[PDB]
């Protein structure tokens, strides 16, 4: 299960 | 930004870094004080949608105001894919593209540089001060009603106290109005409030500020 | 501002941060004494209407006279619909000179036709004016209340009054005759005889120098 | 009601 | 980064002094709170793996997390020389994280036809190291995370979403917490007037609803 | 500044805010002390009139010593009319080059003709003699009184003797005589006695060292 | 009496 | 640096002051902590050693340092005249790449030739081997000396213990072996226990994950 | 420094603000300290006469220092005109290149002639000599009082003796010899005996991690 | 025995 | 007498 | 005369 990332806005 | 480059493409123009620790600064200590709008969009002249998210995400506090803006920026792309219903020389933008979360950067600069040119940076940047404005409104500490003068505060510093006050709850401008010609009135103190009624209906706030600048 | 691209068209580069931080600093600590108009000027060469009304929206505090300077700009603009009414571009009226009406690409086009119609430098002195109304109404006191104090130095002194002088902002010849009969007229009663020893036509270096011991 | 937006010159 | 030089050829532009000393202030000062990732691929906009790894070599604390990066980077570099069976020299992984390749390889790639782009590869890698590592610095979990008894709702929301996006579960676990955490934990004041609200109620709502509590 | 534009044509450089920043920080917190000058002239190297007026008008406090060098640089134009009468570009007249009837594109016509009249390098020589007025008057001693304390290091002296001598500004041969009788004369007595020990007309190298124990 | 302006110095 | 002029030659570009203030202030605050090398390479790109001299002589700390990378240099300049025997420019000696012997034109000369003889990247290798040896030097314990404390963070000892292993700089079979085994053994006996229960196949993440509340 | 502009001619480039700002503040601050003159040069390169004088003029405190220096100036200069005598331009005399009696674009025209006559080199020689003087000179300490304390890292002690060796600059021969005795004998007893054991072939190096732990 | 040098990342 | 200048190097 | 000040370089 891996972190979904931290940008709020775009495309990440 | 966009800028063309010395083979004469339209190449994207890095936001740098001076202009992000501007922004950065700017909102972590401005706390969406009305001035946070105008700056924004002085740092953000020119931005493709990447480089809007780009200042967005890198903002570290007021994470609630983020996702108030987050949630904004949904509902005005969800607008525009209402407004503009999908096709049946280039692909046309959903507001998922517009916001920059479904498109590439060279979409982005595609759009922003055709003929006639599609502004998915102008766009997107109206639908983000759409949501900073509902911010500033909301992170406004006072309304303008509960702003009034001490008995022995100057009419100029209760002005500045009013009109930042007018500022950010951003009221119509009818009501704008309303309240500069009434409440600005009605709320001095005493002695002011009486030179203020003398001058009556017609009076500048210079003139206001002059009569009331010795009380 | 305006700068040539490299494919030779007119192109607006942006107003950079470190100028608008100037601005807002200028502004927020300097609260309109008249220094902040100089560098206004000088900090808004070659500027847009858009510009201008970018370093007019970044700064924060004064809001009083924001709206003064709002309401004067209101006023030069209908001033100009009055002497300028309508008629190879579409003529500026007052509100596109502020840049309310005009698009960025119509201030270039103005500011970049030949002959320009500098829609930059018109909306600039608009702008001043009313920056010239606000740092006179912000001046603390008027300068026939500038009087020097006992064993208050005469360069300080004058340091007052000609910063006084400066923000009232009256006519030349109005500044020559409080420059003649109040400066001497208001200083010490020690330093007022040395003064008046001098004469009428004392030059002010001639009048510090005089008055520096005392 | 939408906030009217705060920009006191130009046409926001 | 990639510049043009006057001769016509593909150039390497230094990453500048100023963009280095932004870098390292803004790891040393933030400590990996979420902001670092998003000013980590601003400021590193058209960098070559040579420019990325300046960047990651000039950070002079957090060295666990710098070992939790570089051990991310091997891994991802291992999962490219997979992806990627071995057949312009086409890159292995240590070739993108720029351990085994010049910077003329480098900037070849970048502007080869199609190009390689091993700059923006092997950001991809770096991020995906710096998401673990800012999980792993968030000081608190979102279960821990309570409005004080005299808090300002405003306040706690801005904890509860800061914490949140540090800790960034998937979308549906953001839904139940948003949704169920964010009430549950809020104070005795704030929780019936979020109660009054209705489970649906938008986060504007919620913090209008408690305004003045 | 001028600056060639791409098309070649003679092209104004606005002078920078941060060189502006950094005059105004340089006048307010040195307050004429002698550095003004020299550093005034570096970082107006090239201005035009219109750049030099920035910078003059720029400065908030010393409105006094701004008058005396608005006083100075009014009589260096009526001296300059006096001595170039009214008769290509048209002549300039002193209130040209002080920059007040010009324009900025007078101005770089002037600065850019062949031959050049260098308005802007000829008004830098008004400013810089006006502020040669102010830096001595603003002088706080006369060199007469800067004598030696009791246990004051011989350089700290040294320093504030020709700290003060420069600004005093003597001519070069009134220099000479005090930096031979006053320096020594000055010192205190443990450091008086060593100079007039040496033999007279030490370098000021071996008096520094010889007084370095004292 | 309109205000004068504030430049001491140039064109005013 | 190296820049190509207007006319196409090859010139220096001068090693500019906010590069200088940064390296200075990079050296004097980080005492030759590790970061300090990378910072040092990063801000000497391109550097002839002209540039890399500006930089060594101008920090101004550390004396002591910068004779430990005075000795080195010319240990790897003598190396230089040993491997490659004296005899487009002359083949420069070990004395030349260190600027000692050579002009900045000459080290153009060399920079830029075809193909290159890059001395300005030679003696920045010479530099780095020297820094190298001072950044060990000056690191405060060895790796054997960091242990955790019975009330200290996992990850605060792990920060302490690759702070110290990159200083250290042993080849990477040691760095292998320490991270391996000593970090283990050199934890509190409670992450130690969590540590082995892990057994040796974890990597840093699982490490401190497993330990994160201890 | 000198550029060559669009129209192919030796054109000047000012020594910019930034670059007074850091030289100013180095000299205020570092008061002489021996990295004033490695970062005068670097901060000095490419300079016209005109440049080098602008630098020294804009320094503020020390008018000591500034007039030793003046005067190993103008003895520099009446070597050079003894060495070389009076007889394209002029062959400059001393006080050409001391930039006193040259114009700028006389100095332009020694540089850029071919072969140059590189007065700004020339003249950037003399300043350093005499800089090298006051540096000397502004020494607090001789290396001689440099002395450990019983519970002084030998590591602080190394860099307060090697920043006073460089400060007081002797011959390398007697630097050699200071180096080797002085800094063992000037060693607490605890280090004095450790050093003593290492024997005359001492390396820096190898005196400072034997002491490492002391 | 001489030190590896202190860049993580890269060639050093 | 006329201030004689504070250049200390240079032409003056 | 003194030395010079450079520890690198040609002085």
């Given at each position: 299960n891996s972190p979904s990332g931290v940008f709020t806005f775009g495309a990440n | 930004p966009i800028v063309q480059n010395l083979q004469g493409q339209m190449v994207h123009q890095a936001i740098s870094p001076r202009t992000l620790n501007a922004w950065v600064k700017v909102v972590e200590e401005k706390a969406?004080?009305?001035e946070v709008i105008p700056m924004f969009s002085a740092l953000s002249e020119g931005a493709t949608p990447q480089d809007l998210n780009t200042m967005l995400n890198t903002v570290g506090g007021h994470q609630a105001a983020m996702q108030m803006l987050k949630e904004t920026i949904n509902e005005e792309a969800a607008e525009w894919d209402r407004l503009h219903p999908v096709h049946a020389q280039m692909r046309e933008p959903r507001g998922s593209d517009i916001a920059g979360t479904t498109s590439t950067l060279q979409e982005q600069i595609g759009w922003m540089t055709?003929?006639?040119?599609?502004?998915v940076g102008e766009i997107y940047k109206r639908w983000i001060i759409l949501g900073l404005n509902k911010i500033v409104r909301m992170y406004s500490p006072t309304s303008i009603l509960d702003i009034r003068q001490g008995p022995k505060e100057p009419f100029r510093d209760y002005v500045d106290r009013f009109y930042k006050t007018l500022r950010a709850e951003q009221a119509s401008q009818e009501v704008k109005n309303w309240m500069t010609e009434t409440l600005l009135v009605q709320n001095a103190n005493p002695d002011c409030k009486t030179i203020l009624k003398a001058?009556?209906?017609?009076?500048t706030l210079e003139e206001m500020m002059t009569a009331c600048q010795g009380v």
């Open positions: - | 969406f004080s009305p055709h003929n006639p040119p599609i502004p001058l009556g209906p017609g009076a």
